[PDB]
Amino acid sequence: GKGKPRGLNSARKLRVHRRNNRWAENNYKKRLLGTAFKSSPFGGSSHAKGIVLEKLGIESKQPNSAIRKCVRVQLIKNGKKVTAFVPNDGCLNFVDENDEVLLAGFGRKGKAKGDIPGVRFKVVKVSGVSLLALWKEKKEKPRS
Amino acid sequence: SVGFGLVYNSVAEAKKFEPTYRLVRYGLAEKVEKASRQQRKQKKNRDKKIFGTGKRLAKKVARRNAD
Amino acid sequence: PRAPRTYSKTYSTPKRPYESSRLDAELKLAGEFGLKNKKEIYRISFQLSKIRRAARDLLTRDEKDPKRLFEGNALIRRLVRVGVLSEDKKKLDYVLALKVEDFLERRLQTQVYKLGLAKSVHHARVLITQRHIAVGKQIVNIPSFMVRLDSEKHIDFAPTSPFGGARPGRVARRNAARKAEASG
Amino acid sequence: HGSLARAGKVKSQTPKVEKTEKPKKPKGRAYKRLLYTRRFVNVTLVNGKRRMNPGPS
RNA sequence: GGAUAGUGGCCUACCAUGGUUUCAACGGGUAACGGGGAAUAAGGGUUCGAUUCCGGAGAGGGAGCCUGAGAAACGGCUACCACAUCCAAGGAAGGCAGCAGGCGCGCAAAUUACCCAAUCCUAAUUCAGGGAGGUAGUGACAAUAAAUAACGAUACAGGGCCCAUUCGGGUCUUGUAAUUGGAAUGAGUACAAUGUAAAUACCUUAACGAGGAACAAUUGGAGGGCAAGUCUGGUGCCAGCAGCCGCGGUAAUUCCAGCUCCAAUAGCGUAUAUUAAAGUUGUUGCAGUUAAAAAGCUCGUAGUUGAACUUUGGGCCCGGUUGGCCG
């Protein structure tokens, strides 16, 4: 009988079985439990804003040997502390400290990308000026 | 070019039926310039706040200012 | 509040972007039919897929059904009017099997080049975008016109265009002025 | 730890090579024709793999 | 019986333990206003619907009311509560989840303009009033069309046929120049008129009006996935790239940079969701010996399913079809 019922009056049982077994999938479970709305530190948002706190020199994971040199950001909407990656070559001196920084995700649905452990969000613009523009020197951040 | 055109039997009917803005645009009539929408609405607000003709109120205000 | 006004898409990006065969074939067809961009083949494939799906869901229904007869007759009438298919074939095999190349080798951009009044598909495109060509009474400035033989019956040049007369033109006028100054 | 410095080291030591003067490419209806010519009239490398962008030998 | 415009535990007086419930009551959550509908479509489906129309609720939270045919009405009133304004210190004055605008908030969203002329509404309903509505402005959410100059005459990356004075040349040059230049075009201004409440969001006869330092176009990549460079300089497990596998430790095709190529063309890149992918939710249509998974075994209520049989059977005629043994 292939397990599951095969009767013309088993719609209730099939619907209930599917409803109970749908909880085994991570996406459906998280969506219906609202973990991204509450447990996630972005508040269920694509982008967030925060204040840079300090510099973090966490090392890479094997096989690799490099320093990613991320920053510490305290978000504004909820006040949670996070570690935010600074992507480009020489954007640390632009995103140094005490700036209204805008943060985005990595691209792994809330996981670390590569050799960077414990980080999930990256800096894409700082103090109204994009990190990409700062890197390409198209426009420079004001000192004030 | 393509447009609309209407011929009346007489100038009297043309004036009676044609819109006022159209008559002003053609030159067959002119509308006297008045205050703008905000200004006339504010005038209506002031004289709706004022009850009565207002002459007696103005006289009383002037008398109170004098004394 | 304002009543809604509908809009629709007209092109479909293909499911996989990098095919050394599909990209190469679409590049051949665009180059040999004078197509400045790739979204144009995308939209022509969108229309081809629409008409093919209409033919398929028409054919999936049993024979002699009046809805099938009416829809097939209307589709055949439109396709004969545009003219991509011979007007003495009612087997519907050609309209279902119509390919992008066959569809494109009938639109007016290939027609002008094959008739030779432009000598180049790119030259024809520049002429159209510069408005110095009128398919019929009204002067056209769009490359994608898909004449329905009305413009073929009414083939001519634009009145305010070269070889149409009544206007030397700005560059011609200044050339004449310079020649007059040089002569005296 | 201790490496919270030398940010963009190669970015700083990279020599600033300027942009070379070059005629502007024609984009629009022209670019497809230029690629048509560059692809279908070029038959130089068709021996074993039909290369399209050969490096300078 | 009362009350209601009347039905009714709607509210009062008097009986039973009556009503709902594993076919899920009740309770909790909803990052829930419900629909037409929105995104892929072989099918079956999975998400979304605050928002252009319908219905409902509210117009700071609650309540209670007058007028009125119709309001629990808030651009009506009364009173209390998160607020808040005006004193020569008694008192008075509300309420933009309506237009515009500001503050706070946040990744996130427009001018404190003009008109009642295209549409309709109200009034004594006909000459008035409508931030309803329409016009303009901002900002490229979407969506359709689509510029960045073709080309005459000769110098080659080496191309077809003849005179066969045989690898010297000719009715067309597949395609390149810092040589000469043959009809041409929009944007920005507009002796000028057209769209509108004469004015700029559509055209043209205009006059200024491309000649490639010109009216100049980029986003990321070139190891694979996935088409696209072992070309040069710099750094040297550092700085960095990297959706994943991985590159870089002195010849790095992967980092930064100069020539070439791609998604696309004013549109592309990134982030977060969601759909196909996903026959990794499986009704269609998944697996359970060893990859995760058969309850330790049995009984049993709900639930699902549940031998076979009853007029199975024949004769004639005809309103109606068949590319028909028929043109």
Coordinates of C-alpha atoms in Angstrom, one line a residue, chain C residues 21-97:
Chain C
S21 CA 25.7 26.8 -29.1
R22 CA 22.6 28.9 -28.4
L23 CA 24.6 32.1 -27.9
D24 CA 26.5 31.4 -31.1
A25 CA 23.4 30.6 -33.1
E26 CA 21.6 33.7 -31.9
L27 CA 24.7 35.8 -32.7
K28 CA 24.6 34.4 -36.3
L29 CA 21.0 35.2 -36.7
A30 CA 21.3 38.7 -35.2
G31 CA 24.3 39.5 -37.4
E32 CA 22.8 38.2 -40.6
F33 CA 19.4 39.8 -40.0
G34 CA 20.7 43.1 -38.7
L35 CA 19.8 43.1 -35.1
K36 CA 21.5 45.7 -32.8
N37 CA 20.8 43.9 -29.5
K38 CA 19.9 40.5 -28.0
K39 CA 16.7 41.5 -26.3
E40 CA 15.2 41.8 -29.8
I41 CA 15.8 38.1 -30.5
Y42 CA 14.6 37.5 -26.9
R43 CA 11.3 39.2 -27.6
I44 CA 10.9 37.7 -31.1
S45 CA 11.3 34.3 -29.4
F46 CA 8.7 35.4 -26.8
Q47 CA 6.2 36.0 -29.6
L48 CA 7.1 32.8 -31.3
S49 CA 6.6 30.8 -28.1
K50 CA 3.3 32.6 -27.5
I51 CA 2.0 31.7 -31.0
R52 CA 3.4 28.1 -30.7
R53 CA 1.7 27.6 -27.3
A54 CA -1.5 28.9 -28.7
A55 CA -1.3 26.4 -31.6
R56 CA -0.4 23.6 -29.2
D57 CA -3.4 24.3 -26.8
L58 CA -5.6 24.6 -29.9
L59 CA -4.4 21.3 -31.3
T60 CA -4.8 19.5 -28.0
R61 CA -8.6 19.9 -28.3
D62 CA -10.6 17.4 -30.4
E63 CA -11.4 18.1 -34.1
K64 CA -14.4 20.1 -35.4
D65 CA -14.9 22.0 -32.1
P66 CA -16.2 25.5 -32.9
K67 CA -13.8 27.2 -30.5
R68 CA -10.9 25.4 -32.2
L69 CA -12.2 26.3 -35.6
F70 CA -12.6 30.0 -34.7
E71 CA -9.3 30.4 -32.9
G72 CA -7.4 28.6 -35.7
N73 CA -9.1 30.6 -38.4
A74 CA -8.3 33.9 -36.5
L75 CA -4.6 32.9 -36.0
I76 CA -4.3 31.8 -39.7
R77 CA -5.9 35.1 -40.8
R78 CA -3.4 37.2 -38.7
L79 CA -0.5 35.1 -39.9
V80 CA -1.5 35.5 -43.6
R81 CA -2.0 39.2 -43.1
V82 CA 1.5 39.6 -41.7
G83 CA 2.6 37.3 -44.6
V84 CA 5.3 35.1 -43.0
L85 CA 3.4 32.0 -44.4
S86 CA 2.3 31.1 -47.9
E87 CA -1.4 31.8 -48.4
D88 CA -2.1 28.4 -49.9
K89 CA -1.2 26.2 -47.0
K90 CA -3.8 25.3 -44.3
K91 CA -2.2 22.3 -42.7
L92 CA -1.1 24.4 -39.7
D93 CA 2.2 22.4 -39.7
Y94 CA 4.1 25.4 -41.0
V95 CA 2.6 27.8 -38.5
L96 CA 3.4 25.5 -35.6
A97 CA 6.9 24.8 -36.9

